[PDB]
Each structure stands twice: as structure tokens, then as C-alpha cells.
Amino acid sequence: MPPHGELQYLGQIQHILRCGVRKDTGTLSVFGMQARYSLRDEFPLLTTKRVFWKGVLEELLWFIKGSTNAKELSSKGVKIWDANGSRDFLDSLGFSTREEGDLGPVYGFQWRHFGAEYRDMESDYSGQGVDQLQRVIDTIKTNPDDRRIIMCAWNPRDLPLMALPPCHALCQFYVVNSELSCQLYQRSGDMGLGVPFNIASYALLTYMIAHITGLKPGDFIHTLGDAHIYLNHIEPLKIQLQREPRPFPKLRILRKVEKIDDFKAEDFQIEGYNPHPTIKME
Amino acid sequence: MPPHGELQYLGQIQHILRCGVRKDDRTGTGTLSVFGMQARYSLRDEFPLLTTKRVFWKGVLEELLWFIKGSTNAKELSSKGVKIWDANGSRDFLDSLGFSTREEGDLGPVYGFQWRHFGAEYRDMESDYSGQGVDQLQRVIDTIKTNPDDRRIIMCAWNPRDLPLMALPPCHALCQFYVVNSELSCQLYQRSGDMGLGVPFNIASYALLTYMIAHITGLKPGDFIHTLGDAHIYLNHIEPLKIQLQREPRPFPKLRILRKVEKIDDFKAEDFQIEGYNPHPTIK
Ligand SMILES: Nc1ccn([C@H]2C[C@H](O)[C@@H](COP(=O)(O)O)O2)c(=O)n1
Ligand SMILES: Nc1ccn([C@H]2C[C@H](O)[C@@H](COP(=O)(O)O)O2)c(=O)n1
């Protein structure tokens, strides 16, 4: 039977290890990859190593809120953007004026206020720029056949203001047979560390939008540009490739929610998540 | 011997015919459709101009030089013999989008304007945009020279703020570049793909663009990666495509760049020669 689920991911690791080139403290890398994760009665949270579910869910709610304030995610116990908002790191980018935690116009601002003028992370941007996220939901409801259902985080004008240029440049949604699918264009993928988190994020987003629009989840298609393994991750990845995948968990949404801004972390339960030990890399 | 690059394109047609699902559109005539496909076409001593049906090379090349010029004027392309944008700049089509006031040929802030002036305020097709917004095309060329390992070598045409002014939202949302071993590859994210009429043309445009940037930056072409969103065949085109699928590809031609060129802006159509193109007859 053809490789499905987790074996797509593990297949991509294997391909990089065998066919990737040394491109540099260093990586093995392949340009252009594509995996398909079914979302039908399962949720692609990897089992060969524990994924930081809690980080996935809080990061996403933080984006949905429009927030560009690393402290606002750090308050929920998720520190993954904290280094990017530090005094020293902001100072190194020429942003000595800026308050600690102001990442600039990253995902949350691009998703809700694309094209508005960024001031700081505290400003009110109500009704300013394009609310791409709501515009996606509306189009799914009133014209599911549309082929322009896109949300774009890549904004060349705003790049120089951002703490980090986005890895997730864009996503597109698609509907047929009452199933909502999503494809992510990810320009750069650290396969050991980032990508399992990244798959879970966009699968989570697709579950959320499906729920709001009365559709069932379909596929998550993960497209990569620069797909790489850091050289220090090879040996641990070699341990991991030999573990037997367990079946994917399910994601249960615990109440009927009408607008995407109303989702809360306690609305979500991951069922039957049975991962092998977090055996992870630098 | 490694198989012919074109078999991926014909494979994709076949997967859609076999597994694609009925999905409609504005015209209502209908498609067979799959979401998410990817093909890889080597550009090493070969040019992926499809041979199972003749592709409108002249159209490919003039449109691209038109884009590079930063033009948003259907008439400047039409004047070179290439009518592909004309219907979209006609008084009638523009009126139908509620642009009753706009000059004929003004397509709004489409590819050329996004590539050379992203984020600038669009006025009309004749205005001067020199020094306004981001010149993505040049920033891409500059980054390829000075930092080839960079993972952010991107040129985006998808501008949500400008979408309402465009005569057509772009199919080619973005493209990304990559260098390793002095080879430049390119990946295209195409949000929507008419497999019969547009995809072959599209493969050649980005292959050609990569050849251009490689020549500017002292590199050799590597791969062109074509990634699709909604990949579809119009029901219209099923009989014609079943005809095309019967044909054996001929070997891909080669693309020759006839002089040394310093800046992307200085390419002319006469600079390019397609050697050894041996296509079967045009279809429909
Ligand atoms: N959500 C994220 C964020 C980051 N990265 C990885 C990819 C790169 O290794 C690095 C980002 O660096 P760069 O911008 O140079 O590609 O972290 C990732 O996979 N997923
Ligand atoms: N460069 C282009 C332009 C257009 N199309 C096709 C895709 C769709 O069939 C239609 C545009 O439709 P839509 O905007 O609804 O996706 O033409 C294409 O393949 N390539």
C-alpha cells in the first residue's frame, strides 16, 4: 500500500539524507518537496517523536489574534518567539527605539491587516489593511469553488521591519465534496526541528476553518522550498527513522464556535496521542 | 537512460483524468480537478519547452520581457504580436469589473508592477514609478550574487491590497530561487493551473526567467520546480488532451543566449535562440 501519513515525512528525511547536498555550520538540502497528509478522521501530530502541541495551539491563537508581541505568547508558557523580541536582538537589527517583544509586522499583522502601516505592537489597527483570514472564511462560505482562496504572510514592503522573515510565505485553501484542504508554501524547512511543528500548525488551522464553515477536513499539502537537515541532527534523525509509527491521534473540537476569533485553547482536545520519546536535536 | 522531463507533465494530466473530481467555476462549463501537485524539470543543457504540442514560444518570451519592463499595458505587448492579455484590457472587460473610468489596456497593478514596484501606490499604466516600492526582481539578482545561500530569494506577485484593482488576480503567486554548486534552481507556486492551455506556456516562462537570471549572475541553470494549487482540466479539453497523451515526446530543445548581457533590463528577444525544437502539431 502506498506511503501515507507519517511515512511521507519520514520518506522526505530519507530522501534528503541520500540525495541532499552540502550547503552551508551546515546542512544537507534539497530544493522543492511536497507531502500530502490526510486529515479525514485523524490529525497529523507526529508519533516518532513528541511534538510541542501546546506551542502549536497557543502560537496559532496568538496569530489569529493579530498579535505581534512576543511577550503575549510568552505569557502562555510558549517561549519560541522570545529570542526574536529580545532587547539585544532588536538592537542588532537597528530597532533600539522599539519595545522588547515587538517583532514588527509578522504573521498576525499580515493575516489581519495586510498592507496597513505598522507602527508598534500596541497600536490599534482596527479596520486597517486587508483581513485575509476573515476574507478566506467568507469566500469559503459564499463561493467554495474559488481558486484565489489565499492568505499571504510574505510582504516585501514590510520585510525590513520584521524581526524574522516568515518561513510560511503563503497558504491556499480548496473545497470539493464538502472537504476543505490547505496547501502551505514554506520557503525554508528545518526537517528535524521545525517541520513537525509546522505540519501540526496548518492542519490545526484547517480544522479550525473547516469547523467555522461547516466543512470536513480534507488534505494538508506541505510544499517546501529549501528543505534541510542540520548536520548535528543527522544521528538523532537516524534513531528516529527506525521507530515504528503509531497511528495518528484525533483532534476533537469540544463546542460549536461561530467566529474564528472566539476559539480558545480549552476548546481543543488531542485524543490517543501516543508518541515515542521526545528524542530531539539542537 | 533517465526518462524525458515531459512525462511528468503528461503524468499529471493522466492523474487528473483518472483521479480528479468534478469542480465548477465562473464560466460553469466545469473541470476535473486535483489540489496540490509538483513536477521537477531539469534545465541542465536542455529547455523544457513541451514537444507533444507546439507551445507559443514567441508569446512566452515577449510576455516575459514585457513583465521585466514593468509594464501594465496590454497594448505594449499586443504591439509585439502577442494578444494573450488583450481581452483583459478591453473597454468591455474593464467596464464589467467596474473600471468604467480606466483607459483601454490598463490592466492595473499586475505582474510587471508587482515585480518592479511592490507596495507602491498604483495610479495608472502611464505613470512614472521610478524609485517607488520594492524592486523584487533586482533584489533577487543582487542577493543571488552576494549571498547565494540565502533562503529568502523570493519574488511575490500576490498583493492583497492591490487585488481589487487588478484585471486578473495572478496565477503565479510567487517564485523562489536557490543556488547550490553554482546552479540556480527556481520554484513556482501557481495557485491555479489550466493543464491543457496554460501550464505548458507557464513552464517555459519560468524556465526562461531562470535562464535569464543565471546568465546575469554567472551561474548555470539547475531545476525548475512547478508546484500547483488547483490543477484542473476543463471538460472541453478532455478529448484534445486524450489525443495529445498518445504522442511520444521528442527530446527537449536547447536555449541559446546569443550575447553577454549585464542587466536584466537589457535582454531583447533577438538575444534568444531555441535550437532543435521539434514539436508535434498544435492542438486546440
Ligand atoms: N516556523 C519555522 C521557523 C523556522 N524554521 C527554520 C528554517 C530555517 O533553518 C530557519 C530559519 O532560517 P532562514 O530564514 O535562514 O531560512 O528555522 C522552520 O523550519 N520553521
Ligand atoms: N498564466 C495563467 C493564467 C491563467 N491560467 C488559467 C487557470 C484558470 O483555469 C484560469 C484562470 O482562472 P482563475 O482565476 O479562476 O483561477 O486560466 C493559467 O493556467 N495560467
Pairing of strands A150-152, B220-234: unpaired
Count of beta carbons in the 10 Å neighbourhood of residue A273: 18
Q: B231 CB contacts (<8 Å, ≥6 apart)?
A: B12, B16, B20, B33, B34, B35, B36, B37, B193, B195, B199
Spatial separation of the C-alpha atoms in residues B9 and B6, rounded to whole Å = 5
Count of beta carbons in the 10 Å neighbourhood of residue B274: 16
Spatial separation of the C-alpha atoms in residues A188 and B183, rounded to whole Å = 18
Ligand 2 atom with least separation from CA of B169: 14
Between helices B6-19 and B199-217, what is the axis angle to 10°?
Answer: 150
Spatial separation of the C-alpha atoms in residues B190 and B169, rounded to whole Å = 12
Spatial separation of the C-alpha atoms in residues A146 and B26, rounded to whole Å = 9
Assess whether the C-beta atom of A188 lies below 6 angstroms from ligand 1: yes
Q: Which residues pair with A81 in a beta bridge?
A: none
The reply to whether residue B149 touches residue A219, judged by beta carbons under 8 angstroms, is no
Ligand 2 atom with least separation from CA of B25: 15
Resolution in units of Å: 2.4
The CA-atom distances, in angstroms, between A152 and each of A106, A172, A276 are: 11, 9, 35
CA atoms within 13 A on the CB side of A79: 3
Task: State the DSSP code for A114.
Answer: B
Q: A94 CB contacts (<8 Å, ≥6 apart)?
A: none
CA B9, chain centre distance (Å): 15
Q: Give me A37's grid cell.
A: 497528509
The CA-atom distances, in angstroms, between B168 and each of B71, B93, B153, B174 are: 15, 11, 25, 15
Between helices A195-213 and A132-142, what is the axis angle to 10°?
Answer: 50
Which residue from B102, B98, B79 is spatially nearest to B89, judged by alpha carbons? B102
Task: Tell me, yes or no, if B280 comes closer than 8 A to chain A by beta carbon.
Answer: no
Question: Under a CB-based contact definition with an 8 Å cutoff, are residues B38 and B226 in contact?
Answer: yes
Interface test with A, best of B26, B35, B41, B113 (most A CBs within 10 A): B35
At which residue does the C-alpha cell 497557543 appear?
A58
Looking at residue A34, its amino acid is Q
Burial class (CB in 10 A: 0-12, 13-18, 19+), B212: buried
Spatial separation of the C-alpha atoms in residues B93 and B95, rounded to whole Å = 5
Q: Which domains does chain A show, CATH number per domain? A: 1-282 (3.30.572.10)
Q: Give me A150's grid cell.
A: 489565499
Spatial separation of the C-alpha atoms in residues A220 and B271, rounded to whole Å = 43
